[PDB]
């Protein structure tokens, strides 16, 4: 029973760590770059006005 | 009638872009029409944009290139732009200024109508409740058009908005429980687009009932300021006086808005968003609001503008202010076009504000409203499920989420997708909608009353 | 006496020889006498915003200098009248011209002077009696519903030297005549009042009575009051679809003034076609809604100056009928189109804009419009209390919440029925987003509720708490999973689904849900919250006990109870009377209690 | 400086307007000066009316403070008189006694917020019924409402309105229910009217409340309603014989029910 | 004293928006107050916005509607706006411009003070030190306000920031282990909220301390500009001359920023960041920095500006510059508001920089700082444990996690949740804090020194 739970937990931990790494290395940087670009472009609109 | 001789001024005081400012003008008339004879005899026409004492800021339609002070002769017609209109304008091709370009004679006026139009009393404007069976299930099924409505086609560069407009033109017709006369106003359309539309009308045999106003890309860009009004004026003459059910297509309101911005920047007016004139809303409204039916008349003017959204941005001032005026919008999507779907109509952002009163029992069928509502709801939920899948993966999707994805796939494959020459009657569109809704169990069709689920679902 | 046109640029004329002209004064520009309003003075030249198309207006054209500002004729004939943005009667124009076009410079009287009105003076008045502004010196039987009380104009006063006897009088006949400081002023039944001036009242009282819309979500979660100041999105599916006509057909209000500031052509046609055909039950008779409704129709292609003055005309008519002692519910179809008109006129005037191109005085104008609402002890000696409840519709670009017009609105209005784009896409109507929408009249309405619906306030509190808990739990259910939820969390989620789908979801096209009486709303919410409390009691009490109870057990046991709670929304007040509906809901509560007693 | 939101000129005009309106209300509810306590309590404002002045003279006096020029206090004092006058007028044919009037006035003046008082709500309901019946045309709804509102006015004059008499509450509720009921619910209108005449403690409620012609018309209305679906001409003649009754009565309705049951057996 | 007669001009050269441009003025004074009579006798006030040569551009407080050249007169008072200040204006309601609106008499001046005031000398200001108790536990026990601090309240539209402001005005006072006053300034506050403030202060019996300035939303906006300056001039008079500890509550500084934007546009200045004036930082500093203790005077001026964060964006210029100028923040949370907690003050993002100077032995009590720190730590841990429980499940939680959840619930139900008319002395707030801390055993209170736990933990 312990070893079965051990294998299942190992797989689940790997999947969840992959999810967290994917978020914090792909999704969050993407949104941060989008926000920086949006702020810059709104600054440009204000400059043109 | 105006019997007094016109006054010709060689007093041009300045030229600035499309504007020609004259001085020493005897009682300038705002919006008056002027005829500029250039030194070499080239005759152009313009409209007095503003007057200040003895000055007059004419705006030349053909452009100011070649105009010089001391020699250009501006003859003031003494009247606003009154275009000639006749019933035989159907089956004719004119440039943006209304002159023939089909090698026919000049229009023998049945009447002279102000291009600005005559405002119609709202008390006697009939509410359009007759559906137009365009044959496009993405429009008939979910964004139905009522005869007399203003409903643009929002698209971008490279999308098939011209093809959709041609399909609507050649398939538009009432729902079977009077053929449309098409008035076309091309503004800034390349030669390919104008040739496409003209060939489409000739091939489909409708040219006898089509009046084309062509202002190609090479043509002057201040001329397209009057090109739509001209067209609409003719439409009005055909609709409210000749009793013809007119369908007005305006190819690129984006190019018309660019012409407006050009004139505004030349005038150094206080700009609006993105440099467009602060009064773009009113100028666009004076064009869009000329659709609809009226009491006592039998004709109508269905209006289908076409917009090229810059950067696919539906918040751009042109599409934004067009949404504020027109009753809905048909929205051509770049993603669907890239995925080779036709028509690439995205039914989530598009709507028809006169669909509710045009569909239903007696008009089309009992289930039309509910079927459309449930299709829209399922499509939105499927799009959200797709967005979630792109992040978390399909193995984490429940059975209902897989059902939503299957509905989305079959909806874009069977309902939206459609042959360019295939006109699906509203009933066939609704049958396809039901075949797609049957993917879900009745317990998941929350937006369809049970009285209709028990009648249409089990089949 | 009269100036001359010096220049023209769109709607902005510039007239010379206007030495003594006053700001915002009315003038007639051109040989057709187009209405215009002086918006700026420079020495002896006046800039004029024209209320009609200026095409064909030539320099040197006469400019007649009328001495009055933009004003409305208030008197018999408003009810059932369809008006242009500047009081021009569209129906009378159509009848007089016999054509479908609004002639440029048409000068038909706003109020017909040919209709004989049944006028009955206030019997207690007499020659020599002292009267002041707002005194009801006679009543005109305008129609079966509205008794048009003829009030002395504000800022008028004196001794009645003549009061006409009861009879039939034109809108032009001299009906009263009073002397003050030796000067004799003769008053007919119609009074001219500037649209931009607030009509005086004795005292603006607090608003303490709900203005019942037909929607359970708006009536319960985000109440409005008589004399309230509400902002509502103009999104499709909601708004003009149900709420406006639902307020029209039945509500606490006694008059409806509906101004189409920037209405689309065919949508304005829809309004003008539907409204004259709606009916309401009054004193056991079905009577047309036009008998207590007035419309100020202004399409988007009409001159921008008219679009700017449409809101002011509407609120002035609403104030006039408030002074009568009525409760006037006003609907501004779009304050966003009004703000667009202000922006365009500001640009034409070459003023420096604020953020996003609007004039920096947009907030001031919105305040001047909205704050004219409220409940008031009307002027005049005969004591009365009226109210004007403004509901301004906003429609920002792409549902923007930072839109300057919306931002200026939120700082003024006390109620805001925000829009959930997700609910609208899902087709959940009304699409009110109950997380940012708010109503600041709950505290004022506590007094009304604790006397008429004593048990409603805790129900509303628990409903709001449950909805917020569901909002907090859904993020987690979708981010991680549904397996880790406690039993109480499951009760919260499923009761929130119940409330959202069958108490906050109201289809306004059905015979049973077109208008939901507040007794129906409070009874339904009482049943749902009683179920919530009792189910939570069960799951919590049986926790840490052998005979544990879980949400699954409850759902499986009493699927009938859940179905009945779901069908509670189907009760039809028209045929299922108030007593019947209350008895049915009490029976549902009894069944719930019995089934939980069996479970326990 | 603005007072209450009005320019001081408008405030001082409103003061004299309120004084004049109070004088008019007093002249209306008591032209004979019977209500001496009320006259004394309002004497400070009626001094400017009993003695003849000009509008500008009273305005100047108010501007100088000689007049009572607290527009809020004047508004309250005028609202009391207006409510009393509303009570007197709504029952104009059925005038009440002096002591009752003065007691009603005292309860008014004691009330914290007279506008929101239950007294005001009851007066609003009575005025609603009376306004409905001012131009009403003959029909069973309108006839029943007229009779019921006449008896309601009688009870109001007898017991005033500050006393929440159960009979008056029943009359209010039934009259409002009949008013709100649709004109096509004839059976329900007759049901409510007969239920009222049943539940009134008096056996013949309308003996002196209504003119003889209207009493006979009410009896005729009930007889006509009973006429259709009668199995025998003899029973119709018995209905005609009952029609000889001068006014409606509980026993008359019981006789109608007796004939109805006879027809139930016979039909 | 100004003995010379005032000059009245009929030389109105123009009218433009709110501005009356007069000409031929004798030595125009900038910012002069000028009373102008309209043709019909209506009297209005105005302020000389700009001066040039012999011209004078008078921004009229009311509108320019009805103003005309050739008949409108304009008397130049010869002096800038000076307000009459006394102690008798404590217990009065004034409008934005200082005219009483409580039907009381005009202020019988003890002095005539220029509203713009002068900047308090940095070398004369003293560190605020002792505490001003607002009766609200969420800020007495966790964000206490020092005598001389500037600590704004941040909220969005619809949150009960005005109700919290009224509560603070009704309950504010000294710790008390008649030298306190409150100057309430309301800007752009709709009629309903202005009536709420006025009636609340009158009814609750605290008016003897409160001087109330009400600038309704529909009152002139220049009155909105001068309202906070009137309020702070009165506060400076009462604090630095009458020597009483004043608390200034300036409501809806966002409305003041809007009025500033309107005046800037009237001056024809180009919009700055996000549409607001570039000098808004200096103007906000001018308002806020009229606060603090001073050397040699026993009075002070605490400030509690209240802001409606537009779009709930803490980066907006108004809240951003307010945080740059002030010394803390009290956050009104929409989540707590929706959960029906009052006051919905979130204590995690809120902060009071000078809390340490406002607590301790002789100011509040020995254990104030330790109790506050431990309460904050346990609240943060409770939120964290709620997040964890949402993932692991209730059973998986340990005993300490259950204790933290219990403390969180009882803290939001007993400490934060207060009720509008529940006035808690800071000692009562600390007693409640200790009741909540006694949920945990002495060992888990790691942020409270044992010297304090041994004294206050028992019982």
Coordinates of N, CA and C in Angstrom, one line a residue, chain E residues 51-191:
Chain E
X51 N -4.7 87.5 -16.0 CA -4.6 88.9 -16.1 C -3.6 89.2 -17.2
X52 N -3.9 90.2 -18.0 CA -3.0 90.6 -19.1 C -3.2 92.1 -19.5
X53 N -2.2 92.9 -19.5 CA -2.4 94.3 -19.8 C -3.5 94.9 -19.0
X54 N -4.5 95.4 -19.7 CA -5.7 96.0 -19.1 C -6.8 95.0 -19.0
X55 N -6.6 93.7 -19.5 CA -7.7 92.8 -19.6 C -7.8 92.0 -18.2
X56 N -8.9 91.2 -18.1 CA -9.1 90.4 -16.9 C -10.1 89.3 -17.3
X57 N -9.6 88.1 -17.2 CA -10.5 86.9 -17.5 C -11.0 86.4 -16.2
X58 N -12.3 86.7 -16.0 CA -13.0 86.3 -14.7 C -13.7 85.0 -14.9
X59 N -13.2 84.0 -14.2 CA -13.9 82.7 -14.2 C -15.1 82.8 -13.2
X60 N -16.3 82.8 -13.7 CA -17.5 83.0 -12.9 C -17.8 81.7 -12.1
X61 N -18.0 81.8 -10.8 CA -18.4 80.6 -10.1 C -19.5 79.9 -10.7
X62 N -20.7 80.5 -10.7 CA -21.8 80.0 -11.5 C -21.4 80.0 -13.0
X63 N -22.4 79.6 -13.8 CA -22.2 79.7 -15.3 C -22.2 81.1 -15.8
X64 N -21.8 81.2 -17.1 CA -21.9 82.5 -17.8 C -23.3 82.6 -18.5
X65 N -24.1 81.6 -18.4 CA -25.4 81.7 -19.1 C -26.2 82.9 -18.6
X66 N -26.7 83.7 -19.6 CA -27.4 84.9 -19.3 C -26.5 86.2 -19.2
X67 N -25.2 86.0 -19.1 CA -24.2 87.1 -19.1 C -24.2 87.6 -20.6
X68 N -24.1 89.0 -20.7 CA -23.9 89.6 -22.0 C -23.1 90.8 -21.8
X69 N -22.4 91.2 -22.9 CA -21.7 92.5 -23.0 C -22.8 93.6 -23.1
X70 N -22.3 94.8 -22.8 CA -23.1 96.0 -22.9 C -24.1 96.2 -21.8
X71 N -24.4 95.2 -21.0 CA -25.3 95.3 -19.8 C -24.8 94.7 -18.5
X72 N -23.9 93.7 -18.6 CA -23.5 93.0 -17.4 C -22.4 93.9 -16.7
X73 N -22.6 94.2 -15.4 CA -21.6 94.9 -14.7 C -20.8 94.0 -13.8
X74 N -19.6 94.4 -13.4 CA -18.7 93.6 -12.7 C -17.8 94.4 -11.8
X75 N -18.1 94.3 -10.5 CA -17.4 95.1 -9.5 C -16.2 94.3 -8.9
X76 N -15.0 94.9 -9.1 CA -13.8 94.2 -8.6 C -13.5 94.5 -7.2
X77 N -13.6 93.5 -6.3 CA -13.5 93.8 -4.9 C -12.2 94.3 -4.4
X78 N -11.1 94.2 -5.2 CA -9.8 94.7 -4.9 C -9.0 93.8 -4.0
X79 N -9.4 92.6 -3.7 CA -8.6 91.7 -2.9 C -8.9 90.3 -3.2
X80 N -8.0 89.4 -2.9 CA -8.1 88.0 -3.2 C -9.2 87.4 -2.2
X81 N -9.6 86.2 -2.4 CA -10.6 85.5 -1.6 C -10.0 85.3 -0.2
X82 N -10.6 86.0 0.8 CA -10.3 85.9 2.2 C -11.5 85.4 3.0
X83 N -11.3 84.4 3.8 CA -12.4 83.8 4.5 C -12.4 84.3 5.9
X84 N -13.6 84.5 6.5 CA -13.7 84.9 7.9 C -13.7 83.7 8.8
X85 N -12.7 83.6 9.7 CA -12.5 82.4 10.5 C -12.7 82.8 12.0
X86 N -13.3 81.9 12.7 CA -13.5 82.1 14.2 C -13.7 80.7 14.8
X87 N -13.8 80.7 16.1 CA -14.2 79.5 16.8 C -15.7 79.2 16.7
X88 N -16.5 80.2 16.4 CA -18.0 80.0 16.3 C -18.4 79.2 15.0
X89 N -17.5 79.1 14.1 CA -17.8 78.2 12.9 C -17.5 76.8 13.2
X90 N -17.4 76.4 14.5 CA -17.3 75.0 14.9 C -18.7 74.6 15.4
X91 N -19.4 73.8 14.5 CA -20.8 73.5 14.8 C -21.7 74.2 13.8
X92 N -21.1 74.4 12.6 CA -21.8 75.1 11.5 C -21.7 74.3 10.2
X93 N -22.6 74.5 9.3 CA -22.5 73.9 8.0 C -22.4 75.0 7.0
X94 N -21.3 74.9 6.2 CA -21.1 75.9 5.1 C -21.0 75.2 3.8
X95 N -21.3 75.9 2.7 CA -21.2 75.4 1.4 C -19.7 75.5 1.0
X96 N -19.4 75.2 -0.3 CA -18.0 75.2 -0.8 C -17.3 76.5 -0.6
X97 N -18.1 77.6 -0.8 CA -17.5 79.0 -0.7 C -17.6 79.6 0.6
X98 N -18.1 78.9 1.6 CA -18.2 79.4 3.0 C -19.5 80.1 3.4
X99 N -20.5 80.1 2.5 CA -21.8 80.7 2.9 C -22.6 79.7 3.7
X100 N -23.0 80.0 4.9 CA -23.7 79.0 5.8 C -25.0 78.5 5.1
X101 N -25.2 77.2 5.3 CA -26.4 76.6 4.7 C -27.1 75.8 5.8
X102 N -27.0 76.3 7.1 CA -27.7 75.8 8.2 C -28.8 76.8 8.7
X103 N -29.1 77.8 7.9 CA -30.0 78.9 8.3 C -29.5 79.6 9.5
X104 N -28.2 79.6 9.8 CA -27.6 80.4 10.8 C -27.0 81.7 10.1
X105 N -26.5 82.6 11.0 CA -25.9 83.8 10.4 C -24.6 83.6 9.8
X106 N -24.2 84.7 9.1 CA -22.8 84.7 8.5 C -21.8 84.7 9.5
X107 N -20.6 84.1 9.2 CA -19.6 84.0 10.2 C -19.1 85.4 10.7
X108 N -19.2 85.7 12.0 CA -18.7 86.9 12.5 C -17.2 86.7 12.7
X109 N -16.4 87.3 11.8 CA -15.0 86.9 11.7 C -14.2 87.2 13.0
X110 N -13.4 86.3 13.5 CA -12.3 86.6 14.4 C -11.0 87.0 13.6
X111 N -10.9 86.5 12.4 CA -9.8 87.0 11.5 C -10.3 86.8 10.0
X112 N -9.6 87.5 9.1 CA -9.8 87.3 7.7 C -8.5 86.7 7.2
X113 N -8.6 85.4 6.8 CA -7.4 84.6 6.4 C -7.5 84.3 5.0
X114 N -6.3 84.5 4.3 CA -6.2 84.0 2.9 C -6.3 82.5 2.9
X115 N -7.1 82.0 1.9 CA -7.4 80.6 1.9 C -6.1 79.8 1.5
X116 N -5.4 80.4 0.5 CA -4.2 79.6 0.0 C -3.2 79.4 1.1
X117 N -3.2 80.2 2.2 CA -2.3 79.9 3.3 C -0.8 80.0 2.8
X118 N 0.0 79.6 3.8 CA 1.5 79.5 3.5 C 2.0 78.2 4.0
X119 N 3.1 77.7 3.4 CA 3.6 76.4 3.8 C 4.2 76.4 5.2
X120 N 3.8 75.4 6.0 CA 4.3 75.3 7.3 C 5.8 75.1 7.2
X121 N 6.6 75.8 8.1 CA 8.0 75.8 8.0 C 8.5 74.4 8.4
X122 N 9.3 73.7 7.6 CA 9.8 72.4 8.0 C 10.6 72.4 9.3
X123 N 11.3 73.5 9.6 CA 12.1 73.6 10.8 C 11.1 73.8 12.0
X124 N 9.9 74.2 11.8 CA 8.9 74.4 12.9 C 8.0 73.2 13.1
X125 N 7.9 72.3 12.1 CA 7.1 71.1 12.3 C 7.7 70.2 13.2
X126 N 6.9 69.4 14.0 CA 7.3 68.5 15.0 C 6.7 67.1 14.7
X127 N 7.4 66.1 15.1 CA 6.9 64.7 14.8 C 5.6 64.5 15.5
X128 N 4.6 63.9 14.8 CA 3.2 63.9 15.3 C 3.1 63.3 16.7
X129 N 3.7 62.2 17.0 CA 3.6 61.6 18.4 C 2.2 61.1 18.6
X130 N 1.5 61.6 19.6 CA 0.4 60.9 20.3 C -0.7 60.6 19.3
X131 N -1.7 59.8 19.8 CA -2.7 59.2 18.9 C -4.1 59.9 18.9
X132 N -4.7 59.9 17.8 CA -6.1 60.3 17.7 C -7.0 59.1 17.4
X133 N -7.9 58.8 18.3 CA -8.7 57.5 18.3 C -9.9 57.8 17.5
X134 N -10.2 57.0 16.4 CA -11.4 57.2 15.6 C -12.5 56.3 16.0
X135 N -12.3 55.5 17.1 CA -13.4 54.6 17.5 C -13.6 53.4 16.6
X136 N -12.8 53.2 15.6 CA -12.9 52.1 14.6 C -11.8 51.2 15.0
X137 N -12.1 49.9 15.3 CA -11.1 49.0 15.8 C -10.1 48.7 14.6
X138 N -10.6 48.6 13.4 CA -9.8 48.2 12.3 C -8.7 49.2 12.0
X139 N -8.8 50.4 12.5 CA -7.7 51.4 12.4 C -7.2 51.9 13.7
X140 N -7.9 51.7 14.8 CA -7.3 52.1 16.1 C -6.3 51.1 16.5
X141 N -6.6 49.8 16.4 CA -5.8 48.7 16.9 C -4.8 48.2 15.9
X142 N -4.9 48.6 14.6 CA -4.0 48.1 13.6 C -3.4 49.2 12.7
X143 N -4.0 50.4 12.6 CA -3.5 51.5 11.7 C -3.6 52.8 12.4
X144 N -3.4 52.8 13.7 CA -3.7 54.0 14.5 C -3.1 55.3 13.9
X145 N -3.7 56.4 14.1 CA -3.4 57.7 13.5 C -2.7 58.6 14.5
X146 N -1.5 59.1 14.2 CA -0.8 60.0 15.1 C -1.4 61.4 15.0
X147 N -1.1 62.2 16.0 CA -1.6 63.6 16.0 C -0.6 64.4 15.1
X148 N -1.0 64.5 13.9 CA -0.2 65.2 12.9 C 0.1 64.4 11.7
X149 N -0.5 63.2 11.6 CA -0.3 62.3 10.4 C -1.2 62.7 9.3
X150 N -0.9 62.3 8.1 CA -1.8 62.4 6.9 C -2.0 61.0 6.4
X151 N -3.1 60.4 6.7 CA -3.4 59.0 6.3 C -4.6 58.8 5.5
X152 N -4.6 58.7 4.2 CA -5.8 58.7 3.4 C -6.5 57.3 3.5
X153 N -7.8 57.4 3.2 CA -8.6 56.2 3.0 C -8.7 56.0 1.5
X154 N -8.5 54.8 1.0 CA -8.6 54.4 -0.3 C -9.9 53.5 -0.5
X155 N -10.7 53.8 -1.5 CA -11.9 53.0 -1.8 C -12.2 53.2 -3.2
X156 N -13.2 52.4 -3.7 CA -13.7 52.5 -5.0 C -15.2 53.1 -5.0
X157 N -15.7 53.3 -6.1 CA -17.1 53.8 -6.2 C -18.1 52.7 -5.6
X158 N -18.9 53.1 -4.7 CA -19.9 52.2 -4.2 C -19.6 51.6 -2.8
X159 N -18.3 51.6 -2.5 CA -17.9 51.2 -1.1 C -18.3 52.2 -0.1
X160 N -18.5 51.8 1.2 CA -18.9 52.8 2.2 C -17.8 53.6 2.8
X161 N -17.0 54.3 1.9 CA -16.0 55.2 2.4 C -16.6 56.5 3.0
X162 N -17.8 56.9 2.5 CA -18.4 58.1 3.1 C -19.1 57.7 4.5
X163 N -19.6 56.5 4.6 CA -20.1 56.1 5.9 C -19.0 55.9 6.9
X164 N -17.9 55.4 6.5 CA -16.7 55.3 7.4 C -16.3 56.7 7.8
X165 N -16.3 57.7 6.8 CA -15.9 59.0 7.1 C -16.9 59.7 8.2
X166 N -18.2 59.4 8.0 CA -19.1 59.9 9.0 C -18.9 59.3 10.3
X167 N -18.6 58.0 10.3 CA -18.4 57.3 11.6 C -17.1 57.9 12.3
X168 N -16.1 58.1 11.6 CA -14.9 58.7 12.1 C -15.2 60.1 12.7
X169 N -15.9 60.9 11.9 CA -16.3 62.3 12.4 C -17.1 62.2 13.6
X170 N -18.0 61.2 13.8 CA -18.8 61.1 14.9 C -18.1 60.6 16.1
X171 N -17.1 59.8 15.9 CA -16.4 59.1 17.0 C -15.0 59.6 17.3
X172 N -14.4 60.4 16.4 CA -13.0 60.7 16.5 C -12.8 61.5 17.8
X173 N -11.7 61.3 18.5 CA -11.3 62.0 19.7 C -10.0 61.6 20.2
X174 N -9.6 62.2 21.3 CA -8.3 61.9 22.0 C -8.5 60.7 22.9
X175 N -7.3 60.0 23.2 CA -7.4 58.7 23.8 C -8.1 58.7 25.1
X176 N -7.9 59.8 25.9 CA -8.6 60.0 27.2 C -8.3 58.9 28.1
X177 N -7.0 58.8 28.5 CA -6.5 57.8 29.5 C -7.0 58.2 30.9
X178 N -11.8 69.7 26.2 CA -12.5 70.3 25.0 C -11.6 70.9 24.0
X179 N -10.4 70.3 23.9 CA -9.4 70.7 22.9 C -9.3 69.8 21.7
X180 N -10.4 69.4 21.2 CA -10.5 68.6 19.9 C -11.6 69.2 19.1
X181 N -11.3 69.2 17.8 CA -12.2 69.7 16.8 C -12.1 68.9 15.5
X182 N -13.1 68.9 14.7 CA -13.1 68.2 13.4 C -13.6 69.2 12.3
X183 N -12.9 69.2 11.2 CA -13.2 70.0 10.1 C -13.5 69.1 8.9
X184 N -14.8 68.9 8.6 CA -15.2 67.9 7.6 C -15.4 68.7 6.3
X185 N -14.7 68.3 5.2 CA -14.8 68.9 3.9 C -15.3 67.8 3.0
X186 N -16.4 68.1 2.3 CA -17.0 67.2 1.3 C -17.0 67.8 0.0
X187 N -16.4 67.1 -1.0 CA -16.3 67.7 -2.4 C -17.0 66.8 -3.4
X188 N -17.7 67.4 -4.3 CA -18.4 66.6 -5.3 C -19.3 65.5 -4.8
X189 N -19.9 65.8 -3.6 CA -20.7 64.8 -2.9 C -22.1 65.0 -3.3
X190 N -22.8 64.0 -3.9 CA -24.1 64.2 -4.4 C -25.0 64.7 -3.2
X191 N -26.2 65.1 -3.6 CA -27.1 65.7 -2.6 C -27.5 64.7 -1.5

